Amino acid sequence: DYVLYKDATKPVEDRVADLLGRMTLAEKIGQMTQIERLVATPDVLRDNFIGSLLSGGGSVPRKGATAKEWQDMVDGFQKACMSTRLGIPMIYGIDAVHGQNNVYGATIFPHNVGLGATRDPYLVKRIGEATALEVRATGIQYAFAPCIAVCRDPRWGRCYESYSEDRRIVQSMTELIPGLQGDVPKDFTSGMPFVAGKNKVAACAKHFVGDGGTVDGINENNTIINREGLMNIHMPAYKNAMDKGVSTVMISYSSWNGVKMHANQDLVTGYLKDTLKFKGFVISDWEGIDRITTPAGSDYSYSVKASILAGLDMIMVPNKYQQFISILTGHVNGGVIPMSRIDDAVTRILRVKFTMGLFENPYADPAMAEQLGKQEHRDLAREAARKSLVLLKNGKTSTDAPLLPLPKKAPKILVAGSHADNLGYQCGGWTIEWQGDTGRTTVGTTILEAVKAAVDPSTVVVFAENPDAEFVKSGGFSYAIVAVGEHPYTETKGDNLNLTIPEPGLSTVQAVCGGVRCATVLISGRPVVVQPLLAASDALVAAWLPGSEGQGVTDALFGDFGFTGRLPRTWFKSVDQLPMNVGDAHYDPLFRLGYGLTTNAT
Ligand SMILES: *[C@@H]1O[C@H](CO)[C@@H](O[C@@H]2O[C@H](CO)[C@@H](O[C@@H]3O[C@H](CO[C@H]4O[C@H](CO)[C@@H](O)[C@H](O)[C@@H]4O[C@@H]4O[C@H](CO)[C@@H](O)[C@H](O)[C@H]4NC(C)=O)[C@@H](O)[C@H](O)[C@@H]3O)[C@H](O)[C@H]2NC(C)=O)[C@H](O[C@@H]2O[C@@H](C)[C@@H](O)[C@@H](O)[C@@H]2O)[C@H]1NC(C)=O
Ligand SMILES: *[C@@H]1O[C@H](CO)[C@@H](O[C@@H]2O[C@H](CO)[C@@H](O[C@@H]3O[C@H](CO)[C@@H](O)[C@H](O)[C@@H]3O)[C@H](O)[C@H]2NC(C)=O)[C@H](O)[C@H]1NC(C)=O
Numbered sequence: 001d002y003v004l005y006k007d008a009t010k011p012v013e014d015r016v017a018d019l020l021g022r023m024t025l026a027e028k029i030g031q032m033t034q035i036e037r038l039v040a041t042p043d044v045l046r047d048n049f050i051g052s053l054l055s056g057g058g059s060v061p062r063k064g065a066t067a068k069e070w071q072d073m074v075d076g077f078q079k080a081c082m083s084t085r086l087g088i089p090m091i092y093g094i095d096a097v098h099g100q101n102n103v104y105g106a107t108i109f110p111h112n113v114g115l116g117a118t119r120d121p122y123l124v125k126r127i128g129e130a131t132a133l134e135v136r137a138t139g140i141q142y143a144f145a146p147c148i149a150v151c152r153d154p155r156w157g158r159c160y161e162s163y164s165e166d167r168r169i170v171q172s173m174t175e176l177i178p179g180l181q182g183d184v185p186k187d188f189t190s191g192m193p194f195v196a197g198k199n200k201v202a203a204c205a206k207h208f209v210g211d212g213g214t215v216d217g218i219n220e221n222n223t224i225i226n227r228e229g230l231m232n233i234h235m236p237a238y239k240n241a242m243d244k245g246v247s248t249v250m251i252s253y254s255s256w257n258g259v260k261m262h263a264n265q266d267l268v269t270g271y272l273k274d275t276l277k278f279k280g281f282v283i284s285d286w287e288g289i290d291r292i293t294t295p296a297g298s299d300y301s302y303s304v305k306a307s308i309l310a311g312l313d314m315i316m317v318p319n320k321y322q323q324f325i326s327i328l329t330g331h332v333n334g335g336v337i338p339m340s341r342i343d344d345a346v347t348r349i350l351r352v353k354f355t356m357g358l359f360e361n362p363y364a365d366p367a368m369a370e371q372l373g374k375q376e377h378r379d380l381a382r383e384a385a386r387k388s389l390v391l392l393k394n395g396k397t398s399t400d401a402p403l404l405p406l407p408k409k410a411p412k413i414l415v416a417g418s419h420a421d422n423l424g425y426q427c428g429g430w431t432i433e434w435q436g437d438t439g440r441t442t443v444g445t446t447i448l449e450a451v452k453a454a455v456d457p458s459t460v461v462v463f464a465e466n467p468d469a470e471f472v473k474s475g476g477f478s479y480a481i482v483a484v485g486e487h488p489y490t491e492t493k494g495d496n497l498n499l500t501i502p503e504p505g506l507s508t509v510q511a512v513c514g515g516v517r518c519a520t521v522l523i524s525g526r527p528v529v530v531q532p533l534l535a536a537s538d539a540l541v542a543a544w545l546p547g548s549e550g551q552g553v554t555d556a557l558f559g560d561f562g563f564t565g566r567l568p569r570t571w572f573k574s575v576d577q578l579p580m581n582v583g584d585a586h587y588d589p590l591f592r593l594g595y596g597l598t599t600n601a602t
């Protein structure tokens, strides 16, 4: 007879109810299971009724794989899932945190910290629209973005994934969600999930909650703050995500006053679901439940019990799915976990899939392939790269002539630094590889290339990664652009207590600037010790992690546009002042939050 859930003309809730009612325990626990493609098989997906797959950082089909290759990989897994008794489509997730960053040829936008410096929410929303298009270009339908953590300590390896230390700014930047998922109807009830159609993707507000407030900025650590502060600083943006219909929420590895978020029923169920009335689905982080215990995994049984009872709906195992499914099954069969907990979880997961139209469009659209790296997206990224730059100095003394903007026509100029012609360094973490990489890892324009593409034909451009003072003094240069900074890094690898850039960096700038007026471009994912650099430079710009479009940097350096960016964070004098954010008692910053010198287009 008529199968309600397969009828695309019926209300979502009706379809969810109808489907849930036909599911066996194995099929329900299956929807709650997300596995890495690396361990996925047509059989595994089919026999285990897997409800979701994902690519962790760097998990790709081949290096340099095309958009069709991705589409073919996803469709391949989907066909397996579509062959199950019920034919429930799987949802594929990936970290498109600044463009479809794992994919070769994808547009790499500036990381979040730089986007906050723009103070332009509409721009960010536009990036979310381009990102969605480029993710769908590879056949993926779910992006683990945006990270709305409010980084309160630069020493945190993930501080560049935070728009700012000021919740008010992070709240405003949640416009990425409507960009990725599409605008919600005027009626829309806050808390409901939403995705416009096959050209949009499900989003994910992460990492619930307070992930940006751990002590000393130690990643995945403990966040010590009273409930007033947790709600005043780290919770706000989530309420905005609710109003904008974010489809999912990822739980943080971090703890709040000693309690693991992956096991906090009060926050996940009591607050996020019951209070904010989130109706989408809550997903864990990579082995998130494993790390509830210490050692991690030392008691997987407890991990599953605690996380599921806490309220989580879908688990990112992401490898040992047999162990996960087996253990959860046992608990349900034994009454440790009620069917209502399972049904609730499966209800939310199915609601999201039906709402985004997954049952109507389970497969990739080949016509979307060309969205990947579309020039207009790169132009957008270029605009964002430019708008994110923060000019911290433009002249050694009050009477000096402003070095910037630089003339496009000069007899001979010098471009130097470890970051002047290194695309990988320019993009930072989460680019091609998980921890990011060095060199020409994808399609883009480095600072050097951008310079060569901007100057007048008569302008000779010389490149020298690390020239000694002599080479510069006798080079006959009119001026120099030196680029130095941090190396790509992600998560814990990023935790840093000294926050000083790797060498050669300062030495190159001191060598170059000592020989000719220089404009230093600082590539970093957060504020770093900068007094020495300032001392040697005539002009210094904080470019953060610009992305693949280096011309955005030269668009400001040469005057095609004036600098407009303002600090999204506080720039400290020394690391032992930290923590130290705006509104603090001992606020003694080198540069207040909101600081930024400006220039006018020539
Ligand atoms: C302030 O604290 C931080 C700690 O977070 C510290 O940085 C870390 O230092 C670790 C050593 O104690 C280092 O671990 C070793 O890394 C080796 C490989 O390192 C290279 O490759 C990784 C992988 O991409 C990069 O992240 C590194 O930056 C490094 O990259 C090379 O660096 C050189 C020198 O700058 C450069 O010329 C190369 O071109 C560049 N190549 C690449 C790959 O881009 C391993 O082989 C070894 O087994 C250890 O694991 C950490 O990687 C590093 N963290 C990061 C992300 O930088 C920092 O230390 C300073 O900086 C490092 C790079 C090194 O030069 C130290 O001597 C220097 O002191 C510390 N600063 C202070 C004030 O001490
Ligand atoms: C926040 O981070 C600190 C680390 O900076 C965590 O404390 C550290 O916890 C580990 C184990 O969890 C301790 O490691 C040692 O491991 C060996 C290996 O078996 C064991 O035999 C030792 O007895 C010891 O456990 C480490 O000593 C400890 N270090 C500190 C600074 O106390 C802390 O648990 C983290 N908190 C959260 C909420 O994540």
Ligand SMILES: OC[C@H]1O[C@@H](O)[C@H](O)[C@@H](O)[C@@H]1O
Pocket (backbone or CB within 6 Å): 055, 056, 057, 095, 144, 206, 285, 286, 491
């Ligand atoms: O790879 C997927 C996930 O990996 C985890 O390690 C990170 O904490 C998440 O932000 C990310 O979405």
